[PDB]
Design a protein around this ligand. Structure first.
Ligand SMILES: [Cl-]
Ligand SMILES: [Cl-]
Ligand SMILES: [Cl-]
Ligand SMILES: [Cl-]
Ligand SMILES: [Cl-]
Ligand SMILES: [Cl-]
Lengths: 112, 112, 112, 112, 112, 112
């Protein structure tokens, strides 16, 4: 229940605006252990796997709601979000979407 | 709908406490383009016009509620607010108050 | 009603993780005057008394809810909290718990 | 000797990258009083007049050297500078260049 | 040689400007363990004892030079210093001044 | 001369202390484009390739000197360094060490 893991990815707009570090810091500060990371349509992305108790739903709270017009200040989208097109970041919706998203993006050796 | 514009002003207490930059940064980070700025009862103020989709209601969310005792951490008043007398900042209430507040404080050449 | 005072304490996990300064800064930025401070089971702690209008309930808002899985980003636990065991910080629950907690931890000369 | 004043300006590249607030904050934190501000070839700029003891030479130290390849971390160019073309910011070289730069960019009523 | 200890104190001007937390954070980030702390002419002060390898000379580097007109950006005085009157902070000059300053300001039980 | 590239790596102590994001942010803010990234004796590491004019010598300046007792505040080691054992970060010494370090740690497809 603390071996729990989610997929996170800095969308091209996050990368282009210089927000990769800021996003990582946010998770480091909550205590989540980073487990894997790669820097792969239009723009490069930063795919990450993070681990900790409740990381899946907590990190969704941390991101804020899909529509940054409504996203709470303190959240990533609440602090940095533009519009819904350029919403900076993706994080797995639930435990099933996490397991599938992780495996899609990584070889299993790549993950701790 | 993205040519939208609001009036913002750092009240004398914001200026006196050294919060002008912090306030601007907050808006720069959300992606709003600054459009005009001047530094004019008791204490100097910093009047600004900002532009972007939904800037009017988003920036109100960003400020927090009038009563910083109740203002959410992450918002300007939630992070920096003292009492309701010294509430740091003013931002236009709605699209009508914005158009009027902008024109009151600026010559039209002064605005982009 | 502005002579109001609360007890705050950085739990051993807050101290061990290097968060004392960050916690103080948060309160300094809201305008609360620090009134007393000492750095005393397992791990050292930082006990503080803070003063200002509504400091008791405001600082509880600032901390976030007991369960950092649910704690709002922008709050201390929302930004830094791990699990409910390691919840970083304690703050007096109400005006009675404040007066008792202050007196328990300080000699009265120690308080301003 | 504390009525001293300099001209500062965020070049178009500073504005485009969202660094106006960060730059102001830097000066607010040193204790300089902002005295005037306007937001006017290619890109908008932010012209400012700042006041305090030794503000002219101190702010040059704060900016760092013209060549950000050599600019010291902690300085504006040391933290944010790209190349010498895009060097973010301009500040008056000496007390004579300050008086001339201020008057060039402002009406005298505009300055405190 | 890592049991080394210095005295540090936030002068009244540091306290009045809300810089206690910022100062502590700086030391926490370098890895120094805080060992004791009290919050005692004109204005309250924050006296601290910090411990770590070379803490005495390192923390002097961290403060910057006595004359903030010349103090390096990145240092406390370089980032926050006003003039030499209001120079924010005091730190022991050398290992002898440290041992004496610590004992002057603390009972020995008060120190870890 | 702007296609220049260096190797950077957050040592296990940087990772364990939660400094990966902070380190990346530092480079994003200088304008360097991240080009590749993986998260691989004792402790996990974060290997990165960064690109920009003079990135090799600039990033060495940004890190500070090998001996954090002497490392300048504003630099990574100056702000976060412990002792020379735990010096947080590695960066290629020169253009030859960069080309070799990059190829050692990456497949060439992995690099942009
Ligand atoms: Cl999404
Ligand atoms: Cl209002
Ligand atoms: Cl509790
Ligand atoms: Cl220039
Ligand atoms: Cl002194
Ligand atoms: Cl090395």
């Amino acid at each position: 229940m603390a071996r729990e893991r989610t997929f996170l990815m800095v969308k091209p707009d996050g990368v282009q605006r210089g927000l990769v570090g800021e996003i990582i810091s946010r998770f480091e500060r909550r205590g989540f252990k980073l487990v894997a990371m790669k820097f792969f349509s239009s723009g490069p992305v930063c795919a990450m796997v993070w681990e900790g108790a409740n990381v899946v739903s907590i990190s969704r709270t941390m991101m804020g709601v899909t529509k940054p017009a409504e996203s709470a200040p303190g959240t990533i989208r609440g602090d940095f979000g533009i519009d819904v097109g350029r919403n900076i970041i993706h994080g797995s919706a639930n435990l099933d979407d996490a397991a599938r998203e992780i495996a899609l993006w990584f070889k299993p050796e790549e993950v701790a």
